[PDB]
Amino acid sequence: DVPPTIHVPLPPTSYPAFDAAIFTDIGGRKHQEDRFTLCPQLVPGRDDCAFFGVFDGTVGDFASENVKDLVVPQLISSPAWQEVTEMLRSDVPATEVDEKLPQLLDQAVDDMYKNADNELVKMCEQLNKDYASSTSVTAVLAKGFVAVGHLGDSRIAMGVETPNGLNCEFLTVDHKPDMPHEKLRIMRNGGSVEYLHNHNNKPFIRGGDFSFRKSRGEQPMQLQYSRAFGGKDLKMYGLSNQPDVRVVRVTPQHRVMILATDGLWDVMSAAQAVEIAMQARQEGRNPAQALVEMTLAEQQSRNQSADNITAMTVFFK
Ligand SMILES: [Ca+2]
Ligand SMILES: [Ca+2]
Structure with a gap:
């Protein structure tokens, strides 16, 4: 087939x-x-x-x-x-x-x-x-x-x-997280776009639960692109398919x-x-x-x- x-x-x-x-x-x-x-x-x-x-x-x-x-x-x-x-x-x-x-x-x-x-x-x-x-x-x-x-x-x-x-x-x-409309979607869905020290040009899409999972000693992940296959725990925070x-x-x-x-x-x-x-x-x-x-x-x-x-x-x- x-x-x-x-x-x-x-x-x-x-x-x-x-x-x-x-x-x-x-x-x-x-x-x-x-x-x-x-x-x-x-x-x-x-x-x-x-x-x-x-x-x-x-x-x-x-x-x-x-x-x-x-x-x-x-x-x-x-x-x-x-x-x-x-x-x-x-x-x-x-x-x-x-x-x-x-x-x-x-x-x-x-x-x-x-x-x-x-x-x-x-x-x-x-x-x-x-x-x-x-x-x-x-x-x-x-x-x-x-x-x-x-x-x-x-x-x-x-x-x-x-x-x-x-x-x-x-x-x-x-599809970059800092593109205006991508960024807008991420924030509307409770995620955030992070511009890290010395890396202002390659921001990350970060989930809304990142901080909590990070304090829990876990390893929450980030991506430098705003659309993709997978990313289960980011698909509800702005990562689009x-x-x-x-x-x-x-x-x-x-x-x-x-x-x-x-x-x-x-x-x-x-x-x-x-x-x-x-x-x-x-x-x-x-x-x-x-x-x-x-x-x-x-x-x-x-x-x-x-x-x-x-x-x-x-x-x-
Ligand atoms: Ca790779
Ligand atoms: Ca690569």
Whole structure:
């Protein structure tokens, strides 16, 4: 019932509508909490649909390890997705498809996020995982459209060729606790946004019970992003599972999409990543591995302990 998915490093592999590569590295962390999911053929009988997902876990790998196996099943169980499947298998005029498909994809991704999180949170309740959380950047490719969704601070970069050169941008903006409306939601729900000494630029979302649990000699946790999967004991204090969704038309000029964790972005800009990835391909090298190894080399050069780093490169055709 669920199409085959990939969750291990993937060297350069050619598919009908795109070529993909996936590489990850633990870096200098004591744990590997990054996870990912790639479904090459999302819709049986078709060869132009695929799912892409990368997950940056924190406070253990529980949330990222599990959510990765919940997204595809939840996605296709969506009544919204059933309508996507029915329309792709119908006579319905093309012009009409391309006109309705975007909102159907938007709604399906929305359903996926909320349903996958409800299921994950119930698991966290079962196994007593109070703060296990994970960011998410996902991409659903379907008949020339890519439905981008995300929660947290992992990002998706896009390389598009123009007559004046390669246009490189992020399709997602991080969910940070200090963004005015995020902060507003956290305080309305009894949580707070903490700006700690010497770290004014990276505030934390803190639960309303943090202080009490801290005095009880326990270990309440905080996050530096305001939306995510998991975070059981923060979901009632402002941590949202509402993803920002964006549907983009894959045009002839679209060259590459890069899904990666902050382990890559805290070091490289969108343009730098695309360039490195574009060059690697051009020279027959593993684009995703190039992104990770290049990042690790730079970190050493800076005397910086590297974070977990995961990169998934997708080249359109
Ligand atoms: Ca992490
Ligand atoms: Ca990270």
